[PDB]
């Protein structure tokens, strides 16, 4: 019926679907791209970042520090929340969560907004996003900076700011990182679900999570209320990835298909980017340099660790240690091992044998890949100079990646290789910018590109299509490629942040059940079809109607 | 900017960007008169817009503006009910009812507006939407008519489960606000207890517990029998049946509410722990549930019901014994604690006792300590069981020697409360041969003290046989009485401090040498008094620092540089320049490292700070030849004096003949005077300034800090790879720190010039007592390669609103960054 | 340029400095010993002891640096 749009981010959505007599929030997405405007949080007080020159405005110099012509806020990195004031969040009943990447900011809705409903997500999304929330809170709270800078978030001053800081949107809604007790309270109210499981919400609507194929546990949602169905297609993959393949059959004959989470930089083959990542890694470690891979502890790191496992024996790089430093590294590896039921048929055929499903587990027993909770504990005693480090947050503002770049950026032999497409590569390198390090940008986004989603929409044929505004337009990097947009026979329905969409797909014919006592009392008169005049008393219970004979 | 809001809403666009502008406006506070203005403007703009989302945002913003602090909402209710009169959208109507609920909650005293609002709620309860009915039920629950109970009881049977939960929570809110409920509520909630929805069942069991607590002795008939049952017993049976629910939070709620039904008859209480009506086996089912939260809640329910009913504890006993070995450590902690709680008068027989003594062998220190307090609070017959308890405690002491104090407490409580049973055991414990002279046992051997603590506490209440002791046992009794007296049984300073302070005050007419001698004597006496009376140590060194400030001022004002001219002044033999800096440091130390300061002390502290600033101004004016920098900080000093007279204008008439009031007398001259003449009059007027008095605080302590975890006495370096990080753990004992969350800072100082300052998070400022704080941070250290393990300097700091001062003892830690 | 105020406890003091030599070659370092009395007056009395430090490069590091430069 109605569809509220609390997030403008395409791959980090927060859409509230006011559907019949039940209010459904489709995902909650924390925009961590807001953190790029802030100065990075290091593990130790680096001399270079500490005495950066301040930036002056003739109208604040302690708040703003300029590095290589780009102005950065010297406070803690703040996070752009979904906009929580368009619709009262005490009126929403159910939060459906697709990805663990789209489960961030759940402590913001579930605690600060008076949301008293229930949350549905799969087992692996809840566990992995618990790990990601844990390392995010840890990274913010290792060396606590203060939230000193507040004057730059003013309407008079942010106009005068340069382009990276002026273009930041909804700055007053940015908030500090939530704490660990908020994480625990948010994840305590999640009801765990499995793929193709029917969940009835107050007898009115029926929601099921369908396998999406992007990440292990990641799910698309369909919301059925009698004879009308809403399909929510979040980040999904049509490629041969580790999780269960995308369930395209259950999305069919849907009245409106809300789709989000398409591929950022769609003009990139992920297999070619894996090849480029392995080639650049081999080239760097063959020269005696160092490879730094800023990555999430889960997700694409499993795929690139699989490919690097297949590559090190071919390239002869068995003497090069692979280090995986993360506070949730061991938990991520173990969680990937035990979620075999959520993987594709190739991976879950391996656990029918007494064998680990992911091949990176063999790297620990062969000691090729060593994982540590932190730099300080015993990684500082097991460190060999030519090495590959998978660590830190990919935003390059917090985590162990900051210390590693401050350590290795003064040498041209060392390289950093970017595999996550979530954050802008130039804006990630901007606060470290006078560096001799070679930076390789090879994003391995495996989500749906535009030819794949054109084929999917031709296969499914939804009556209406709801997408973000960025999918109707060409990407601003291209701004001319007409194939890089969503095109359907109806010209879609685009939305921006804080926009309310009215869906005119509401119909008549709510289903009813008639007991056999009334069925005998109705004479099937011949019309030619049949006709019958019925007189009954209507009984409604739990939003399900019954007809009773008087 | 209310007219700006009017112009922007009615001038830019109607449909979409007006919503964006309202969203932008909703994020700023509004003053109360401007609240009235914007409420009038938004309610005028409500009728213009036909878009439902804009009207929903308008209703939400009215609800937000009605919650502002200084705005009385009594003048806007009539327009609110007017816009509810002709509102058709159900979401906007629900938001408007939310606004009306905010209006009613903000004005509890006005009964007429509350009756109007509940009339509106009763009018709008027949709405087809569930959200409107939910908000109307919330409105009735929050305000009511303390008719309302009948209407909410009618709405217990609504088709939507959310409205049913809203009705139950509304009438629960009615009970919580003070209204006494009826009894038909019990039948309605009993019918609703079998609902197909989790939230309805939880709310219904809460309502059942409430109506049972309201009318416990009421008599209700069985629906299927002629016999009559008390209301609290019947509701106890219903909640016991809800203990076996399919939802674990409903089971936790049922167990927790079952713990508070202390008025239940004994018969159902023995029924609920049996294994052979609906109350049978409820606690047996709850103690073996898969979710540990349900088991914990059933443990506290058992504890509350056994504290209420003494006959219930004997049935609780064996289940607690069986559930000591539980897979979750928190569950067995709770079981041991509640077993200690319900061990008031019941005795333990053999198998329960040695099951307790078998689980004494566990490796966890926490449950060992908890079981130690249980053995402190236990009652046991059959003195061979006491011997078994002693043997198990002694072998626990052998296996875990750290728990010797707790084990000695156990044996003290066992001897003190089982005196006659230990008495025949004494020749078996003390190796007393009937005729042989026994060797004296080794003192300071923790098994032997443990035996003696048991024996001596048994001998305290029984003087029947204390002659069984040998001579060396009496000698050891004397030794333990001298050493372990808490286990084995059988204001001149304030007057002197006031006298010394008034001796300083009353002898302020002496020569400078005599004044310096008196101040030195009194500072020494105050320091030694602080070293003697511990509770007066803070006020002693507070007054000592004040007298040190005055002594430094007197010594600086009597320097040889005043007898020479400005060109002949030389700073390489200067003393007053360091003196002014020292007085500044001592004033900051005085203001911020003392807990009991107040305004009546802060004014004298700031007065001494002003005197130090004036002294530094004159000292710097001695060595300056240019006229404009001298004029610059002279103007800065006069600005500081003006800030001081503005801030402390209330207690200005208490500082007679001081520096600041004698400045205030000459202030109009001081603005119009040439700055060198200002410096000269300040130099001549500091020497004539009268010494102030300190109002002594009632309770004042130094902020003390010592770190123990770096432990700077080990020469072993802490090695790590160059360029990587090494973690250092600290443990600070912060004593009498007012706000350690935002003042205590950790400083690490490398051997080079690096002095990295670490701000600890508030999450690990543990507070184990009043005035006591514990700081546990894992500070992070890194540097490139060293040719030798040098040092690092770890120091706690205190920060104040502009600078930081040393706080704790400097501690050195060895660091060896090895190359990669 | 470094400074450390050490306190002698038994008419003997000891402190440790951390000197960085990025520029290769002979580095003449000098150490002073100023004495601060009880009144706070600084007395420059101690010897000006000088030792020369040579910053020799690792052959592997030198080869790596020349390869990166060329």
From Swiss-Prot, chain A:
Q: Does the keyword Lipid metabolism apply?
A: no
Question: What Gene Ontology cellular component terms go with this record?
Answer: cytoplasm; cytosol; INTAC complex; integrator complex; nucleoplasm; nucleus
Q: Which keywords describe this protein according to UniProt?
A: Cytoplasm, Isopeptide bond, Nucleus, Ubl conjugation
What residues bind 1D-myo-inositol hexakisphosphate, as annotated? 2, 19, 506-507
Record's function text: Component of the integrator complex, a multiprotein complex that terminates RNA polymerase II (Pol II) transcription in the promoter-proximal region of genes.
Further facts: Although strongly related to RNA-specific endonuclease proteins, it lacks the HXHXDH motif that binds zinc and participates in the catalytic center. Its function as endonuclease is therefore unsure.
List the signal peptide residues: none
Q: Which domain of life is it from?
A: Eukaryota
Q: How is this protein named in the record?
A: Integrator complex subunit 9
Compartment(s) where it occurs, according to its Swiss-Prot or TrEMBL record: Nucleus; Cytoplasm
What is said about its interaction partners and assembly? Component of the Integrator complex, composed of core subunits INTS1, INTS2, INTS3, INTS4, INTS5, INTS6, INTS7, INTS8, INTS9/RC74, INTS10, INTS11/CPSF3L, INTS12, INTS13, INTS14 and INTS15. The core complex associates with protein phosphatase 2A subunits PPP2CA and PPP2R1A, to form the Integrator-PP2A (INTAC) complex. INTS9 is part of the RNA endonuclease subcomplex, composed of INTS4, INTS9, INTS11 and inositol hexakisphosphate (InsP6). Interacts with WDR73; interaction is required for the assembly of the RNA endonuclease subcomplex in the cytoplasm.
Q: Which residues of the full protein are shown?
A: 1 to 556 of 658
User: What family is this protein classified in?
Assistant: Belongs to the metallo-beta-lactamase superfamily. RNA-metabolizing metallo-beta-lactamase-like family. INTS9 subfamily.
Coarse class of the protein's main subcellular location: nucleus
Renumbered to this chain, where is the cross-link Glycyl lysine isopeptide (Lys-Gly) (interchain with G-Cter in SUMO2)?
58
Q: Which GO terms describe its biological process?
A: negative regulation of transforming growth factor beta receptor signaling pathway; regulation of transcription elongation by RNA polymerase II; RNA polymerase II transcription initiation surveillance; snRNA 3'-end processing; snRNA processing
Coiled coil located at which positions?
Answer: none
UniProtKB/Swiss-Prot annotation, chain B:
The reply to whether Cytoplasm figures as a keyword in the UniProt entry is: yes
Where found, per UniProt? Nucleus; Cytoplasm
The record's keywords, sorted A to Z, are: Acetylation, Cytoplasm, Isopeptide bond, Nucleus, Repeat, Ubl conjugation
Instruction: Tell me the ranges holding the HEAT repeats.
Output: 32-71, 111-146, 147-180, 181-215, 229-265, 277-309, 310-348, 350-388
Site of covalent link Glycyl lysine isopeptide (Lys-Gly) (interchain with G-Cter in SUMO2): 674
Residue(s) of cross-link: Glycyl lysine isopeptide (Lys-Gly) (interchain with G-Cter in SUMO1): 674
Q: Which domain of life is it from?
A: Eukaryota
What are the BP-aspect GO terms? regulation of transcription elongation by RNA polymerase II; RNA polymerase II transcription initiation surveillance; snRNA processing
- Gene Ontology terms for molecular function: protein-macromolecule adaptor activity
Keyword rRNA-binding (UniProt) = no
What SUPFAM superfamilies does UniProt report for this protein, alphabetically? Answer: ARM repeat
- According to its UniProt record, which protein family does this protein belong to? Belongs to the Integrator subunit 4 family.
Q: What does this protein do?
A: Component of the integrator complex, a multiprotein complex that terminates RNA polymerase II (Pol II) transcription in the promoter-proximal region of genes.
* Protein name (database record): Integrator complex subunit 4
The species this protein belongs to is Homo sapiens
Q: What is the lineage of its organism?
A: Eukaryota, Metazoa, Chordata, Craniata, Vertebrata
From Swiss-Prot, chain C:
Where is this protein localized, as stated in its record?
A: Nucleus; Chromosome; Cytoplasm
Q: List the disulfide bonds.
A: none
> Member of which family?
Belongs to the Integrator subunit 7 family.
**How would you summarize the oligomeric state and partners of this protein?**
Component of the Integrator complex, composed of core subunits INTS1, INTS2, INTS3, INTS4, INTS5, INTS6, INTS7, INTS8, INTS9/RC74, INTS10, INTS11/CPSF3L, INTS12, INTS13, INTS14 and INTS15. The core complex associates with protein phosphatase 2A subunits PPP2CA and PPP2R1A, to form the Integrator-PP2A (INTAC) complex. Interacts with NABP2.
According to its UniProt entry, the function of this protein is described as: Component of the integrator complex, a multiprotein complex that terminates RNA polymerase II (Pol II) transcription in the promoter-proximal region of genes.
The protein, known as: Integrator complex subunit 7
Question: Which organism was this protein described from?
Answer: Homo sapiens
Specify the taxonomic lineage. Eukaryota, Metazoa, Chordata, Craniata, Vertebrata
Gene encoding the protein:
INTS7
